[PDB]
Write a protein that binds this ligand. Structure first.
Ligand SMILES: O=c1[nH]c(=O)n([C@H]2C[C@H](O)[C@@H](COP(=O)(O)O)O2)cc1/C=C/Br
Ligand SMILES: O=c1[nH]c(=O)n([C@H]2C[C@H](O)[C@@H](COP(=O)(O)O)O2)cc1/C=C/Br
Ligand SMILES: [Mg+2]
Ligand SMILES: [Mg+2]
Ligand SMILES: [Mg+2]
Ligand SMILES: [Mg+2]
Lengths: 194, 194
């Protein structure tokens, strides 16, 4: 009866792309980089790997470093929108996020980041998983174009959240975008209500 | 098409009850304790809180301590069963576990414990969530009798995994138990296959 919305973290709430680029440039000032306007494809590591030898591994070392996830800046409007969204009648919001393979810091920092921006009580709303298809909900707002896993027919509608890496993608027509948190996310939610 | 089984961690794969009791007794040798045979009700903290003043807080300090989750011993047969279960044709296994409120160590140690007993590749199968009702699957094997949350009608059948705290409970008849990993879990899975 309540509408359930899964909201992705990196690329939707947290600015992974901008934080990575800043830290990559600071740590490797003599390496080439990829300006955000030039990002293409979900995987940062793959494009850097295509840019020059051994750059995939250097990219990876940025997000494997302590404080990388914790120090990500929220995206504009994200904290305000999700707070408003959660307070809406008949609306349950979960933050659904995938950790990286190296688990020393990432899960911890993601919990810490949510506490910081949404408060202790919002920690109950976090779902950490590598497979989003096994989480059920009416909506998934997520910047990754290809969301697959163990469940061939997920219950959610995936709404693509715009990011530098996906902004040029033509979606297969039924599919829909949320262009930024300034875009009309209430209209999207309302279209799913009974 | 593949059968999906969610397997809980504490009380099913990891011996939370025995590890807690050992560490509680070692740290508080002059406090009264609850023998496992005498455990009743899911919440360890509540029963200890009923046993004497300020014992809830002392109990909590055990599982909030570093290395508590990491150093839990697997339950008998658990690692062998889950490994066999995951290798079965048309069967996907996820470990579905709730972290405690204090997130400094618990998420990290749970990932570490899974790596230790199941290997790096099994980390992809972990779902960390306070709400299991929003994870979809055919079966949930879990020692907690009362599993509720945002989804009023979860897709899984909850099979109650026997533990000291629940062994005496009469379930509402449709509900079913897995008595230990030596019990016939394949028969339970097979009853759910198309
Ligand atoms: O290029 C990457 N970009 C990225 O976000 N990640 C990681 C970063 C994050 O933990 C998880 C976020 O995915 P979503 O929850 O937003 O879908 O995947 C990993 C790589 C490459 C690893 Br090799
Ligand atoms: O008494 C408790 N027992 C317990 O397992 N936990 C915590 C321990 C574990 O992180 C999570 C396990 O639940 P399941 O995933 O097995 O369902 O709840 C907390 C308390 C009290 C907190 Br106050
Ligand atoms: Mg993302
Ligand atoms: Mg609400
Ligand atoms: Mg349990
Ligand atoms: Mg299998």
């Amino acid at each position: 009866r309540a509408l359930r919305v899964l909201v992705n973290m990196d690329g939707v709430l947290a600015d992974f792309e901008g934080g990575f680029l800043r830290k990559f440039r600071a740590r490797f000032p003599d390496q080439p980089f990829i300006a955000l306007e030039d990002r293409r494809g979900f995987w940062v590591s793959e494009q850097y790997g295509r840019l020059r030898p051994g750059l995939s591994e250097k990219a990876i070392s940025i997000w494997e470093s302590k404080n990388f996830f914790f120090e990500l800046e929220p995206l504009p409007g994200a904290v305000e929108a999700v707070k408003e969204m959660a307070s809406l009648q008949n609306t349950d919001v979960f933050i659904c996020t995938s950790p990286i393979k190296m688990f020393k810091y990432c899960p911890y920092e993601k919990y810490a980041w949510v506490e910081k921006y949404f408060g202790p009580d919002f920690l109950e709303q976090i779902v950490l998983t590598r497979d989003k298809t096994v989480v059920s909900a009416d909506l998934l707002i997520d910047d990754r174009p290809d969301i697959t896993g163990a469940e061939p027919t997920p219950s959610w509608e995936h709404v693509l959240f715009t990011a530098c890496h996906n902004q040029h993608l033509q979606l297969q027509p039924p599919r829909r975008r949320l262009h930024s948190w300034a875009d009309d996310w209430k209209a999207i939610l309302d279209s799913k209500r009974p």
